Write a protein that binds this DNA or RNA. Structure first.
Length: 45
DNA sequence: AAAAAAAAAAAAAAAAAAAAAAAAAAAAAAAAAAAAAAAAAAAAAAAAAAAAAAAAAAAAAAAAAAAAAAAAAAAAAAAAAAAAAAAAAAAAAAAAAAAAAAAAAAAAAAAAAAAAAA
């Protein structure tokens, strides 16, 4: 509950980039093996 | 033959622009009244000129408002600190003349083709 807190460049970069990488890999890039559709195709259909 | 950089595939992030149609305003560029300014004519109040004159500076001298001296007291202006306005100095720049490289027209002449004669 403080206006400013320290954050390391390493921790912030690692958390943000890992979140983005996992989100992309699981949610837009690769298709599921079962139905063979990405989430965009699944939602559109 | 090694290094480096472009480009393309597909789901994601985020932007930009041209016109039509009417009615009003705001810039911005013109003709066109309208008055300063200037050239060139005749024309007419002012200086000149002269004689003649009388109104205000000199001069005597008193006296009455005065400018320096004395004192008390009020407080305007000057110089030192800071804080804004407004103008030359210097440097930079976008079109703009100069130069150099690529596209289109040109015919001279021949390869290949098409066509026909005897």
């Amino acid at each position: 509950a403080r206006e400013i807190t320290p954050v390391n460049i390493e921790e912030e970069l690692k958390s943000s980039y890992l979140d983005y990488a996992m989100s992309v890999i699981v949610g837009r890039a690769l298709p599921d093996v079962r139905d063979g559709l990405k989430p965009v195709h699944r939602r559109v259909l």
